[PDB]
Amino acid sequence: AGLTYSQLMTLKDAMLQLDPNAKTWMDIEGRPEDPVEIALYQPSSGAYIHFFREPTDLKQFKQDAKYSHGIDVTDLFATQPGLTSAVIDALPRNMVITCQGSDDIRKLLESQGRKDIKLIDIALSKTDSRKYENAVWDQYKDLCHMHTGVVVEKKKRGGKEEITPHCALMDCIMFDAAVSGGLNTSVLRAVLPRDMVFRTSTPRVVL
């Protein structure tokens, strides 16, 4: 139903790689009661937590896919169940998390019993928040491949137009760049081992 004992101990050790007093960004795709992509990012070290979750509500997921993240739902079937709750349980106590644009992070953490985590609300306008969007994707696109669908936005006077998909990890990186006043070239490093974020490794077909 969730993570094994081996896995929870690995996760506890991985969490030691977060500096509890350094700046930490957090962002999600999907609704706070039903997230499908979660990222945490410490720009000082370049360390990031990043993983995915299968949605419970498929109707809301399909609308989020068309207007936000473009994730194909079948790419989420091999995710590790219970990882979101396990990661949130494991975050350092009383740490300060920075988030942009909405109270989604607050509502996710509170729903999981982490009211100790203090949140800095950056009120960047949507336009300013994405000033480094293209540069971040160009530097880091190979860190997240999951945004495969066409994503659209409703236009000011009617109609639609294609936009770049919204990724929780790229968002953390580009939001920090916009608040910092510049995009650094930095080697980033995944905190979670790759064997923890995706589930099944048994060949479905012999070829």
Binding site for Zn ion (CB under 5 A): 144, 167
Q: How far is the CB of 30 from Zn ion (least distance, A)?
A: 11
Distance CA 37, CA 168 (A): 6
Judged by beta carbon, residue 3 or residue 165, the one nearer Mg ion is 165
167 carries a ligand binding annotation: yes
Stretch that binds Mg ion, among 12-20, 23-31, 58-66, 90-98 (CB under 5 A): 23-31
103 carries a ligand binding annotation: no
Long-range CB pairs of 51-58, under 8 A, 24+ apart, other chains included: 51/79, 51/80, 51/83, 51/84, 51/87, 51/192, 51/196, 51/197, 52/76, 52/79, 52/146, 52/197, 53/79, 53/83, 53/84, 54/79, 54/81, 55/30, 57/31
29 carries a ligand binding annotation: yes
Tell me which residue has its CB nearest to Zn ion.
167
**133 interface partner picked from Zn ion, Mg ion, none, CB below 5 to 8 A per type:** none
Q: How far is the CB of 64 from Mg ion (least distance, A)?
A: 10
